[PDB]
Amino acid sequence: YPPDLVTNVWYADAIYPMYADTEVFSNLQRDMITCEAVQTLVTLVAQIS
Amino acid sequence: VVTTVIDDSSYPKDGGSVTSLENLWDFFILALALPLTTDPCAPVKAFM
DSSP, rough: OTTTOOOOHHHHHHHEEEOOOHHHHHHHHHHHHHHHHHHHHHHHHHHHO | OOOOOOOOOSOOGGGGTTOOOOHHHHHHHHHHHHHOOOTTTTHHHHHO
């Protein structure tokens, strides 16, 4: 380990820059739109089949 | 209409260190000015 390793300081220092993630929400909205597409597709198919 | 406030950065970085003598100096100065702060919740902040 680092000879002067303080877990609280090192982790906190790495975490502050590390904590900048928002990709999940955007991906969720895309998946949500994909799910609406799936349902809409089935409904159109139902009209035709 | 007037509020006295203190930057958290005035407090020791990363909350300070029990082993840090420089942090000890920051703590002493902070303790001295903590009563000075007009902030009502300032006691809570110094305690934290």
